[PDB]
Short mmCIF file of C-alpha atoms in Angstrom, two decimals:
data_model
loop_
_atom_site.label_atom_id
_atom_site.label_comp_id
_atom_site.label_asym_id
_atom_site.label_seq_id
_atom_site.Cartn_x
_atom_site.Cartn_y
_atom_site.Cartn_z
CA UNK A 22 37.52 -33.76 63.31
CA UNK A 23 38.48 -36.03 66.73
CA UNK A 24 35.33 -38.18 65.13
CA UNK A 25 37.30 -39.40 62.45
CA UNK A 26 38.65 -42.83 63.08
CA UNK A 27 42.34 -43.18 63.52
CA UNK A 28 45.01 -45.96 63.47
CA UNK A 29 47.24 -46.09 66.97
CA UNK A 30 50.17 -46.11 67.50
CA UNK A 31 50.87 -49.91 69.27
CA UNK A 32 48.64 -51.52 67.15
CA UNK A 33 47.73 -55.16 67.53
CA UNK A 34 46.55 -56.69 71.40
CA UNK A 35 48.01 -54.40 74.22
CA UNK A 36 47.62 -58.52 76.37
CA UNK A 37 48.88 -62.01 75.79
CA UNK A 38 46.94 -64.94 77.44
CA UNK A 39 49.57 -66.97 79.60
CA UNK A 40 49.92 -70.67 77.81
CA UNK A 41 49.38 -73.84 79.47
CA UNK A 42 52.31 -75.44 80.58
CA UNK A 43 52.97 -78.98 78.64
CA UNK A 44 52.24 -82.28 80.68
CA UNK A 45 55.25 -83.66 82.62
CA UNK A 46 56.88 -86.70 81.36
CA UNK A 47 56.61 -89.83 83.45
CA UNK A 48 60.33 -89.86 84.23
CA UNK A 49 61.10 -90.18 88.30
CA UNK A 50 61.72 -86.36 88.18
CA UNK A 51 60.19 -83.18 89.41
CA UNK A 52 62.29 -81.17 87.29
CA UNK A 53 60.33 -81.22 84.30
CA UNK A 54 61.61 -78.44 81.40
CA UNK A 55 59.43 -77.36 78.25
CA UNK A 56 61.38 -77.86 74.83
CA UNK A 57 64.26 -75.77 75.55
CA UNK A 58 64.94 -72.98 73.35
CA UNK A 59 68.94 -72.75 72.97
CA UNK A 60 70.88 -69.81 72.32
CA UNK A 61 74.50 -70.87 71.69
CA UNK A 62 77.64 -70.21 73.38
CA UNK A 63 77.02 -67.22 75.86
CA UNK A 64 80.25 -66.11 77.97
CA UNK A 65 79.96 -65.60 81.44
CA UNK A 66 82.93 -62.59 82.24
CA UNK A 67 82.72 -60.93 78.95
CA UNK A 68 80.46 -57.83 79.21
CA UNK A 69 76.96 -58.58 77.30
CA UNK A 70 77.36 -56.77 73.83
CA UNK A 71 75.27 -56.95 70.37
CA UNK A 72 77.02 -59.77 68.77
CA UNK A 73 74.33 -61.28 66.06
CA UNK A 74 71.20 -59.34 63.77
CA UNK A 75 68.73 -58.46 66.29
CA UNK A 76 70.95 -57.77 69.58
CA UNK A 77 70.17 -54.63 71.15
CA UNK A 78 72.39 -52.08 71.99
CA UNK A 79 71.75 -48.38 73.88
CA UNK A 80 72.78 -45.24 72.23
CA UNK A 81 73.48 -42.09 74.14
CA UNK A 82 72.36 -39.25 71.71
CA UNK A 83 75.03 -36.67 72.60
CA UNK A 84 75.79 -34.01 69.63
CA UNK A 85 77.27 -30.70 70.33
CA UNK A 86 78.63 -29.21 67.14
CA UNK A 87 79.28 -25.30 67.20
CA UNK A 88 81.54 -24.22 64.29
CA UNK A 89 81.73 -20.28 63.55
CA UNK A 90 83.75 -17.99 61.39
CA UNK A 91 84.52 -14.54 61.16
CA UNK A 92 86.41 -11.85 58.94
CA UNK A 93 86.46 -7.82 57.65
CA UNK A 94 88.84 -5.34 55.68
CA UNK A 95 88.60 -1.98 55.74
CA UNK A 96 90.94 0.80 54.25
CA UNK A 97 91.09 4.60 53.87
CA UNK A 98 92.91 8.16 52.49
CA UNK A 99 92.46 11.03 53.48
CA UNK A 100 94.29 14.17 52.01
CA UNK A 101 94.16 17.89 52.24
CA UNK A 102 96.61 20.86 50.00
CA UNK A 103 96.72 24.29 50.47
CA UNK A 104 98.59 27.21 49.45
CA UNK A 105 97.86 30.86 49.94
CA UNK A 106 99.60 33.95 49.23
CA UNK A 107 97.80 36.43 51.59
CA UNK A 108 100.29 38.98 50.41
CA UNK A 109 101.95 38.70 47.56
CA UNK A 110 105.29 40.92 47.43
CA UNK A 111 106.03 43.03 44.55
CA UNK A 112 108.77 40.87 42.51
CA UNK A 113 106.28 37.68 42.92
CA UNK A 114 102.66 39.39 41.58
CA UNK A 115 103.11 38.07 38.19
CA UNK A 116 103.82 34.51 39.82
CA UNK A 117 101.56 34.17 42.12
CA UNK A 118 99.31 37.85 42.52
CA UNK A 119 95.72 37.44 41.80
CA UNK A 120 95.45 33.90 43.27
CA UNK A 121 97.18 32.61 40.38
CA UNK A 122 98.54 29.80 42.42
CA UNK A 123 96.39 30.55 45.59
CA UNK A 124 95.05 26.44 45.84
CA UNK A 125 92.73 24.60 47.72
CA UNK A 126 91.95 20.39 47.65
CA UNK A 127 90.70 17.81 49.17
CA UNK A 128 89.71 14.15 49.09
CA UNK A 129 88.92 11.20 50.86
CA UNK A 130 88.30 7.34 50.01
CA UNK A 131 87.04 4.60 52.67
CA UNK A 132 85.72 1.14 52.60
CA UNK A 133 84.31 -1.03 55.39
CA UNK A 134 83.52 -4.94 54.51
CA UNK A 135 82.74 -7.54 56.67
CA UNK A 136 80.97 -11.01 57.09
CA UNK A 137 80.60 -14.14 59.01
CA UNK A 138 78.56 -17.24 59.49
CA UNK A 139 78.16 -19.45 63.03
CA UNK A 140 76.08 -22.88 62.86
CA UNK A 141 75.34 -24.85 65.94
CA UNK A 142 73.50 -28.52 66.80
CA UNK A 143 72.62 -30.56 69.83
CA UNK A 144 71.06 -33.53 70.77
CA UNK A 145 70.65 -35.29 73.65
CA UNK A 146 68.81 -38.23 74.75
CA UNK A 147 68.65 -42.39 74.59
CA UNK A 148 67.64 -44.63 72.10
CA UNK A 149 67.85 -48.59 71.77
CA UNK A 150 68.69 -49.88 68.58
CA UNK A 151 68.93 -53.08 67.10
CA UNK A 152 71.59 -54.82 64.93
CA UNK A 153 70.96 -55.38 61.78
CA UNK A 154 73.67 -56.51 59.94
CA UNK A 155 77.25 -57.73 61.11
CA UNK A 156 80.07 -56.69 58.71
CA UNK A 157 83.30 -58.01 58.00
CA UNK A 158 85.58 -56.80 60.75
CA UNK A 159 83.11 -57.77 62.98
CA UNK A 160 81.82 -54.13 62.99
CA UNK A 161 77.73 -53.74 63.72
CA UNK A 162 75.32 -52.15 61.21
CA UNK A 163 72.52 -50.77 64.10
CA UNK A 164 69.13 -49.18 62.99
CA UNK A 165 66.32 -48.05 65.43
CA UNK A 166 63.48 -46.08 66.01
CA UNK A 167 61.37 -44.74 68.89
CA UNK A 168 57.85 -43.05 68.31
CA UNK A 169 56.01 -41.54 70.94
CA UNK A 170 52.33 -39.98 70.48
CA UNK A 171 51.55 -37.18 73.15
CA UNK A 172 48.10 -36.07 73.24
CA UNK A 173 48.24 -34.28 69.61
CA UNK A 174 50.66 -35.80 67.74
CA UNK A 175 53.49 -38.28 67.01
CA UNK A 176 57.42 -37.72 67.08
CA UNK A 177 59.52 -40.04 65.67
CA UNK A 178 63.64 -40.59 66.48
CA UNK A 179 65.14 -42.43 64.00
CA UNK A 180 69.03 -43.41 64.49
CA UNK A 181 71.52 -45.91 62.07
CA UNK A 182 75.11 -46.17 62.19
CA UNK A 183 78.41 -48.33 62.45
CA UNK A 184 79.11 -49.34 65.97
CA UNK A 185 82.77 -50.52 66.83
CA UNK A 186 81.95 -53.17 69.58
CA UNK A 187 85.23 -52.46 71.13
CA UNK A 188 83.60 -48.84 72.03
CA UNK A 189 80.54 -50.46 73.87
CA UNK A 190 80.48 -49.72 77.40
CA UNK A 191 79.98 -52.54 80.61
CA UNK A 192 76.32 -51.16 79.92
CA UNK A 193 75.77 -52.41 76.32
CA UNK A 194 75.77 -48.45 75.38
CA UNK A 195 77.32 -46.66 73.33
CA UNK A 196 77.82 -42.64 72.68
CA UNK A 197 76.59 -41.72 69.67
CA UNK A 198 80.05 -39.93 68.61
CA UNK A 199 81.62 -43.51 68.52
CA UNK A 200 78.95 -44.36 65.55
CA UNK A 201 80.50 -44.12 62.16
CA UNK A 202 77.89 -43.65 59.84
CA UNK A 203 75.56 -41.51 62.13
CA UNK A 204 72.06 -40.69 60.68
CA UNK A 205 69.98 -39.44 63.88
CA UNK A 206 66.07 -37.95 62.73
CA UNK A 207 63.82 -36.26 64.78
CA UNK A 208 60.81 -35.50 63.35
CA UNK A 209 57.12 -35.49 64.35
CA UNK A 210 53.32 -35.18 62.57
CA UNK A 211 49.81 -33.07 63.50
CA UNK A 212 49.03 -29.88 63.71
CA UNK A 213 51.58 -28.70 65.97
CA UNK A 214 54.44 -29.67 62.94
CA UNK A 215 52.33 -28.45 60.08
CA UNK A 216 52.65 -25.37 62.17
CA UNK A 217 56.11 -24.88 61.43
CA UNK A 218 56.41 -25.68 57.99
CA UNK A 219 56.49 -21.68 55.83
CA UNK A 220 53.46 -21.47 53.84
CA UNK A 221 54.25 -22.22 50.08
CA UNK A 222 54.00 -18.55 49.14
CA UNK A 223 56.45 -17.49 51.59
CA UNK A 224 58.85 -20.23 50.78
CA UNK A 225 58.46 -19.13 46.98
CA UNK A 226 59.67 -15.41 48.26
CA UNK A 227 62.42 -16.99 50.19
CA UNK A 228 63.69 -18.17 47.43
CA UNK A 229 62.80 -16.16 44.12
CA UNK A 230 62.38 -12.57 45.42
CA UNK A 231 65.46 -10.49 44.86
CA UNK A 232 65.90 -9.67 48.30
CA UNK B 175 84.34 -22.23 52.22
CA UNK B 176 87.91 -21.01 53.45
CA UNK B 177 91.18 -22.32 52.57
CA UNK B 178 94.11 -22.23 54.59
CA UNK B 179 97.32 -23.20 52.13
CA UNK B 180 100.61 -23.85 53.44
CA UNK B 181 104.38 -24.22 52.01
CA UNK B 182 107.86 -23.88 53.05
CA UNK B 183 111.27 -25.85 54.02
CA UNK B 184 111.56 -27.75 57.16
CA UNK B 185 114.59 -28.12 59.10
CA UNK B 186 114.14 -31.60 60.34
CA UNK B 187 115.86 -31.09 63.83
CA UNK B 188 113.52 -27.87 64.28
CA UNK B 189 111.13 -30.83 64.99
CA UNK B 190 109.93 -31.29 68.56
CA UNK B 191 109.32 -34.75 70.22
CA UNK B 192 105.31 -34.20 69.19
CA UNK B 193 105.93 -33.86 65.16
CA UNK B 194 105.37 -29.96 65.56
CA UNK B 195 107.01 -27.17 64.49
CA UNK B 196 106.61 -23.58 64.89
CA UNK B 197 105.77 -21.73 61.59
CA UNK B 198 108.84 -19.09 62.32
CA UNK B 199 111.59 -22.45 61.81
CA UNK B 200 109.93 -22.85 57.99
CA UNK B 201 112.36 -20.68 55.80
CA UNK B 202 110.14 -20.12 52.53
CA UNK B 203 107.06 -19.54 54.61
CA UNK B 204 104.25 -19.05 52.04
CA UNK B 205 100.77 -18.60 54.89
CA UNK B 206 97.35 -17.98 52.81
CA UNK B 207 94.23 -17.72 54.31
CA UNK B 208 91.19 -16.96 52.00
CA UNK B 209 87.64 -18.03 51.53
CA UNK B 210 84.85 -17.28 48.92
CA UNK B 211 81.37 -17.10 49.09
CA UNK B 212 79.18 -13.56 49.00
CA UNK B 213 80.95 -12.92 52.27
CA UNK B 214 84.29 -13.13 50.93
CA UNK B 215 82.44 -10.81 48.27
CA UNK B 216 81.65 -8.82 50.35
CA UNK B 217 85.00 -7.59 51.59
CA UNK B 218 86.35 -6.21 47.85
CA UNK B 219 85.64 -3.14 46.88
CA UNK B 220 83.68 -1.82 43.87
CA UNK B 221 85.19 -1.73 41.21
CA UNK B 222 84.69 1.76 40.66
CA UNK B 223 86.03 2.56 44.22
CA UNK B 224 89.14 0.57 43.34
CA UNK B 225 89.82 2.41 40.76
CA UNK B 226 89.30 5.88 42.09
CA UNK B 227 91.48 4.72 45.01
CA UNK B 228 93.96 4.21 42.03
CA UNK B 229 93.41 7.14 39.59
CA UNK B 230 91.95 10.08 41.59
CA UNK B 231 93.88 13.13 42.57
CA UNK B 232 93.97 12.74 46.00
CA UNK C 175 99.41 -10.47 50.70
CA UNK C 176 102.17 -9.30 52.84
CA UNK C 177 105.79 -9.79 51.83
CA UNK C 178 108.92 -9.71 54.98
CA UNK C 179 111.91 -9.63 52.81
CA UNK C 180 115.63 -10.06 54.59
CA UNK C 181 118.65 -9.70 53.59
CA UNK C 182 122.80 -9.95 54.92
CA UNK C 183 125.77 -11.50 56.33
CA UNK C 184 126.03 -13.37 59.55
CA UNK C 185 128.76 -14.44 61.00
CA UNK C 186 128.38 -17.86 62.61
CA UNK C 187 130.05 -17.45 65.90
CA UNK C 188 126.98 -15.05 66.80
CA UNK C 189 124.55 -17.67 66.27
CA UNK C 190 122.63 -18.86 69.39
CA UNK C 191 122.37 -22.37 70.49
CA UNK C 192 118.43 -22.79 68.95
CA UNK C 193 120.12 -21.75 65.76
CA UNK C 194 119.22 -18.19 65.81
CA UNK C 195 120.55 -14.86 65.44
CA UNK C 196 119.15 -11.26 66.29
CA UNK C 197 118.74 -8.95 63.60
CA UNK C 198 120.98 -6.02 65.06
CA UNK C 199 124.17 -8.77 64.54
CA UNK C 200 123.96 -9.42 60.70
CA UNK C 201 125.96 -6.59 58.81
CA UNK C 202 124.37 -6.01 55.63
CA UNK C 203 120.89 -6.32 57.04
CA UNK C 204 118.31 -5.43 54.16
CA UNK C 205 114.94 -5.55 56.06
CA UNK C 206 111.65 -5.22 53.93
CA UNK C 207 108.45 -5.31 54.94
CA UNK C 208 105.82 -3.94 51.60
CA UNK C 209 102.09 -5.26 50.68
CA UNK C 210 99.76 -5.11 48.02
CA UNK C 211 95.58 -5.28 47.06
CA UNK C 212 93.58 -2.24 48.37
CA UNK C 213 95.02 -2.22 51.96
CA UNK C 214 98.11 -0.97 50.08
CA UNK C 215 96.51 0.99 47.26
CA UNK C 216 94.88 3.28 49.97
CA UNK C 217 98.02 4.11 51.68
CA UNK C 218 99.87 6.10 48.51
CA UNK C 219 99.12 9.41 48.27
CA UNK C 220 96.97 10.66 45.26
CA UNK C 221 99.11 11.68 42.37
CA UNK C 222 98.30 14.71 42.17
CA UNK C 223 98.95 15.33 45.97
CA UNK C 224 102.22 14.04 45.55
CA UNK C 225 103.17 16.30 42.90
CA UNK C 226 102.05 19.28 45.02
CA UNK C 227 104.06 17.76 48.00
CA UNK C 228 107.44 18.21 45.67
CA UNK C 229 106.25 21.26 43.64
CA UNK C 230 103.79 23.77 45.99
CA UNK C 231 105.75 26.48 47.15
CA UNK C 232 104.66 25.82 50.10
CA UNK D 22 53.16 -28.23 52.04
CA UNK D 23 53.57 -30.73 54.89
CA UNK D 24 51.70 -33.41 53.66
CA UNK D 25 54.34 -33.51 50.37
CA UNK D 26 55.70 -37.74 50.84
CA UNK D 27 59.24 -37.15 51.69
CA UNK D 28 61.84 -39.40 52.22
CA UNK D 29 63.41 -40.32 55.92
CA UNK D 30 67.07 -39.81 56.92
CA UNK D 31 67.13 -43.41 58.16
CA UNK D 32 65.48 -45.08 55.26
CA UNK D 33 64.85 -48.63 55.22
CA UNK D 34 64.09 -50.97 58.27
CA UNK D 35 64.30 -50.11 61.85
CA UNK D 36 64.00 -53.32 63.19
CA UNK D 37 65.85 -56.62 62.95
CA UNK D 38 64.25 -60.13 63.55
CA UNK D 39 66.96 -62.20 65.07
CA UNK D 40 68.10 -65.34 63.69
CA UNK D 41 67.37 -68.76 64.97
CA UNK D 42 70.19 -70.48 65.45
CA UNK D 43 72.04 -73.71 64.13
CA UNK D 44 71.06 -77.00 65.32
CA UNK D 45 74.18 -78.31 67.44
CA UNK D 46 76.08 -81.22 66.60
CA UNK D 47 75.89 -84.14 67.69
CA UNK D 48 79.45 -84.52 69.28
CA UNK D 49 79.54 -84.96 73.17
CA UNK D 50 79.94 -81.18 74.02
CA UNK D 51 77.64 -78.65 75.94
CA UNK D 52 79.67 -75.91 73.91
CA UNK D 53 78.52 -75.43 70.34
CA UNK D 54 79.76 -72.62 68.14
CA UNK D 55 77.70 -71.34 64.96
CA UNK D 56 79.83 -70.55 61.48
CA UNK D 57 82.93 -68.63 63.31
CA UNK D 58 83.58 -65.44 61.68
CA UNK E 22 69.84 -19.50 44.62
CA UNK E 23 69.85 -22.26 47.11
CA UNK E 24 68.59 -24.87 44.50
CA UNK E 25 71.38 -24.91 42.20
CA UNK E 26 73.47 -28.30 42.38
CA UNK E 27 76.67 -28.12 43.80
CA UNK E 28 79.48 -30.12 44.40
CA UNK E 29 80.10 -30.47 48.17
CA UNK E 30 83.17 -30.26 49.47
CA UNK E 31 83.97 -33.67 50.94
CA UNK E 32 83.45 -35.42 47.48
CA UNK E 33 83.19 -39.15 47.17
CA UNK E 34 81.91 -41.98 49.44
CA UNK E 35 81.49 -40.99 52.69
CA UNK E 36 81.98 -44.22 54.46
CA UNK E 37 84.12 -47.89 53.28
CA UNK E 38 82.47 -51.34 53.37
CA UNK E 39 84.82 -54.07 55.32
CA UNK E 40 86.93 -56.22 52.92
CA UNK E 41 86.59 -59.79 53.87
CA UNK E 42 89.87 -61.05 55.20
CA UNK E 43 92.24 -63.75 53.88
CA UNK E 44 91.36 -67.38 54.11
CA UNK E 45 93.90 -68.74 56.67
CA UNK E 46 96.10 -71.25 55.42
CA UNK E 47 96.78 -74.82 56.57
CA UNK E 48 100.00 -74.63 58.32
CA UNK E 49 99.38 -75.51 61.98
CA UNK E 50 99.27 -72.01 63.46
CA UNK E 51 96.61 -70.18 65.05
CA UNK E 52 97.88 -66.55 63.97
CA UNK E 53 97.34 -65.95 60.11
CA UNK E 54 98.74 -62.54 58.81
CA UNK E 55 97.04 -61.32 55.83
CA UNK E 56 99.87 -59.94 52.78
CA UNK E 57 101.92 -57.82 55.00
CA UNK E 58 102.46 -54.22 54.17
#
């Protein structure tokens, strides 16, 4: 099963051959400069943030959600009557002589419900994303991905959003709680992921037996 | 899913400096807090203990 | 649902600066505090314990 | 049941080629400023 | 159970695209104020 051939992951050459250098003009210079690739207008005391489609920009993956509820009601009665006439006098035997009124009752009701629910996330890491689209209010679109193949496997983290470049650190980065649209992925392939997937049978149960 | 409802009359110089008021400064305070769900089902009785709670002797 | 009913007259000179009054100063004070649902339901005693309450002997 | 194709969370493209950019003018300035937004 | 459709609870879009703003006009002024509210 390891003979079976297999894509990688960086495809393509993992090497790039340096290029020769063009021929210096004959000009009385020894500065000589290869065509000169421009870039536009780049300030000098503004901090360096994503400001075109394909900028990069650093995301700090920090999620820490924890929401929880709780409740119960209860309620009970209890009651208990008696009446005995251990010795009944003579003027009250036709009232209350041969236990004719001699009682004894009882009864009780209770009820206990409760319920609840808690769910809790985190993340944590970094990821560099790139800019894909610049919207109207000058607001950046950002979509990346990061995949990373340990021994058995592959695990990709996937992020998009809306970045407000006034939140953009001196760092070009970003917390991912400033990111409007957030979609953050983690996900991964092999053996050890098929693993933890609930076989179809017991995922039928989950769902269709009646308890 | 809970719900939290809400309703009265504000006094508008009950208001504090942070646009807050207590809930005891709302004269027709009307406070509900109820959810649904099988939890929420699971907190009223049967109905045929509700109705022995109702009709039984004691 | 809980219900805190009030009731009386209050004579203005008692009230406070924060525009309140205590309870023990208003004259015809009609204080009521009552539910319903279940919670209530199981706190009246079973009819037929409280007809043996008024009409046991003893 | 985990080779079912499913569908990412962040579908489409997670890259972005950047743009080349406009040719300056030909007015005598170092500073050149594409289509302001 | 958990396959039945339901409505969630925060209906609707779940995010706003940027409206375009206002072409400026031609009076001589640097600050353009879209149609105030």
């Amino acid at each position: 099963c390891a003979w079976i051939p297999a894509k990688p992951l960086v495809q393509g050459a993992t090497t790039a051959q340096p290029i020769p250098g063009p021929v210096p003009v004959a000009n009385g210079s020894i500065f000589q400069s290869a065509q000169p690739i421009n870039y536009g207008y780049q300030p000098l005391f503004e901090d360096r943030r994503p400001r075109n489609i394909g900028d990069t920009l650093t995301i700090v993956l920090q999620e820490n959600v924890s929401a929880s509820k709780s409740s119960s009601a209860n309620a009970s009665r209890d009651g208990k009557t008696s009446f005995g006439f251990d010795t009944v006098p003579r003027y009250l035997q036709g009232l209350f002589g041969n236990s004719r009124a001699d009682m004894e009752a009882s009864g009780g009701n209770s009820f206990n419900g409760k319920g609840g629910a808690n769910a809790s996330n985190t993340f944590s890491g970094t990821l560099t994303v790139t800019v894909d689209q610049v919207l109207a209010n000058g607001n950046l679109h950002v979509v990346g991905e990061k995949q990373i193949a340990i021994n058995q496997g592959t695990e990709f983290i996937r992020f998009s959003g809306v970045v407000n470049p006034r939140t953009i650190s001196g760092s070009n980065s970003v917390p991912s709680t400033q990111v409007a649209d957030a979609r953050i992925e983690y996900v991964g392939n092999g053996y050890i992921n098929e693993a933890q997937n609930m076989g179809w049978l017991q995922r039928f149960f989950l769902n269709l037996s009646p308890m």
